[PDB]
Structure 1
């Protein structure tokens, strides 16, 4: 007599499964799915069967699964042309995991103090252009700021200066090549696709030249690029330009809209909540009488602003569907999920479970005080996912976001240009961010 399996939601369309109801609003869909069917709930995108894993226990089984059980490969087939064949998430488990392990130390610890200064510098620089007052699209601001700081830190000064223009064009041409038909199709050829391919080729060209020029010279800059040059596999072999190029692109895509979206939300949430705006300004102003400048050591200790970021990430996790292929029958909360099926964690859903986050719809940074529960379940809060494939860039992200917010708020008053309740997540975007017309006003402080 066969074994307990997850409940399946009624079918919808025979060609399409539930994808149309899903695509309408993905957060609503997944919220409804869990509400009706619980922690482990099956639906079907097209032919494929997805099982939504929400709550502490189901989340745990997801993040703690071996790579042999849950494969993250097929999430990113859309990206494989951008990243490169046989490059991270297109490589074989062992080679993949070494490449990821090369990134980890490039994004924490030793280079973090340099990264801080670069980020602060870049924001200071952009602010000098600014009029005494005006009206900006906040999401355009944070997207610029994040790509300038990202690229300076991950790629190096060359890409901010000499290769500024060219890289800009390359990035959008790579960006544009993220079409959903690419994921759906094994397919690759189209007009926008050769533009995507030409851009990858040009970037690898530019990476190769810079390896050689840095080597011809003796400059030893601090960026992920440099550290990937200086890295090696366990057998002593080196990364190729193909591999360095893919790994750097993956890192920039990983961090760009995620950061920029989160930064935008931190400002919006503060701007519609004066009590927290006051707490954060107080902290920032205190920093400046304590350090006199934004410093790596000062960024490490900003509890009020950390806690705001954490709560913004609870209520606005920029990645809302983390997908895996099941490669081996595995069992979650006494139900069996067969190989061939897919399985996905849903931050935006699990973050809104009352038993984990009392009064889930309320914005409350004080959830994360030592008195109150933050990590106490390490698979509740999961904006950076979890387990072996937790965000590498989470420390980088936190410093970047803190740095940007300090400098902006220290120098500039802001206010929303539209009704507070009108700023909403656009759940239709591949990386969830605030809805695109997102106007804000500014005025030099004092």
Structure 2
């Protein structure tokens, strides 16, 4: 019957899959450039209906699980798995502590790799806040390294089959087994050498036979799941926030002055990370607009819908793209330029473009972790920027993301040098 508009190219074995695995943003932009607000590309044996623009995005984000389901939209997660405002102050204090612990051995000056640093830091902030400080204290660099391998195991080939015999998938499975072993060791460690946390709660549950209900494997899967949403997103966002501050010294200087003035009231990071830090918040908003951690959002249609005359049927993959929508020229003047001022009271481009400023989604599925993520950035930089001065150790334009996996991560090198203030 009727065929939806299809983007050019995709003449490879799996259609546009190979291009999606190399330059997904370019592919999605070409879909919009050639077809408009509703266009398709072929992801192996699956047609993806890519929606963009306010009108189409509104349909996407206002749709409940009854119309567009996310349940089976991400097959790459199956092998991997196998927030209260009142607690926010406590989490801010926890994050401050974790950052100070991470930079405790920095000394007077040195060099760091952003991916390595923030990936490890966010493993500690996430585990400490979500599972418990007790659990985080039993973790070290090994956990972060293994967790990284899990994220690297999200090749788009998962849309063909999540268990293909490729190196990244093999490393993904090996990494998960390694995490189970680490968790099993922690459990055994508590038996021999007794504030209780989530792990203690799970260990205490008994089966209908008196035996422990949960195995190290089941517990590990729960913990992986609890930490996955916020890890790669917060890690990447922290890295890009620092990169953009260094790329734009005027913003860097403004944030520094602001931080010094604000903390002059003598209140802690747990107080200030939950309150306005204007310049930093606008730099963060702009960083998220330009470098949204999730470049594409997927759904599986559960019924028949029509968007601008185009028909969507049950079973069809439907997607929205923060990467593309966040840069629509009509909605964001000079979309490729770093302009924190676009979020100040006069313009408020994030609030005005309810359906296209979507680094945190919109509508019914709006990010429930956004408040936590924003607080975390404020807490992290409140510490880092007041303690140290940062400079780029490589050309500004050489910092870039690796888009070869569904989980976007910073490519290396991403070297930065620091010196005590």
Would you say same fold, with TM above 0.5?
yes
TM-score scaled by length of structure 1: 0.82
Separation in 2 of the partners of 1:277 and 1:194? 41
- 2:377 is aligned to 401
Q: Which residue of the other structure, out of 339, 352, 359, is the alignment partner of 2:334? A: 359
- 1:287 is aligned to 262
Conserved in 1, the CA contact under 8 Å of 2:282 and 2:340? Answer: yes
- 1:124 is aligned to 100
- 2:294 is aligned to 319
Conserved in 2, the CA contact under 8 Å of 1:132 and 1:443? Answer: yes
- 2:207 is aligned to none
What is the CA distance between 1:285 and its match in structure 2?
0.6
Conserved in 1, the CA contact under 8 Å of 2:73 and 2:317? Answer: no
- Any residues of structure 2 matched to 1:42-53 within 5 Å, and which? 42-53=40-51
Separation in 1 of the partners of 2:283 and 2:401? 17
- 1:80 is aligned to 78
CA spacing shift, 1:202–1:136, aligned 2, 3 Å: closer
What is the aligned length?
407
Separation in 2 of the partners of 1:286 and 1:417? 29
Separation in 1 of the partners of 2:230 and 2:346? 31
Give the gaps of 5 or more residues in structure 2.
205-212
Separation in 1 of the partners of 2:163 and 2:400? 34
Separation in 2 of the partners of 1:282 and 1:339? 54
CA spacing shift, 1:174–1:26, aligned 2, 3 Å: closer
Conserved in 2, the CA contact under 8 Å of 1:258 and 1:318? Answer: yes
What is the CA distance between 1:72 and its match in structure 2?
1.2
CA spacing shift, 1:257–1:129, aligned 2, 3 Å: same
- 1:21 is aligned to 19
The Cα RMSD (Å) is: 3.1
Separation in 1 of the partners of 2:263 and 2:161? 53
CA spacing shift, 1:173–1:310, aligned 2, 3 Å: closer
- 1:152 is aligned to 128
1:392 aligns with 2:358: no
Separation in 1 of the partners of 2:145 and 2:404? 25
Conserved in 1, the CA contact under 8 Å of 2:146 and 2:176? Answer: no
Separation in 2 of the partners of 1:401 and 1:430? 23
Conserved in 2, the CA contact under 8 Å of 1:262 and 1:433? Answer: no
Separation in 2 of the partners of 1:165 and 1:362? 36
Give the gaps of 5 or more residues in structure 1.
85-106, 231-238
- 1:136 is aligned to 112
- 1:97 is aligned to none
TM-score scaled by length of structure 2: 0.86
Q: Which residue of the other structure, out of 224, 243, 261, is the alignment partner of 1:268? A: 243
1:256 aligns with 2:254: no
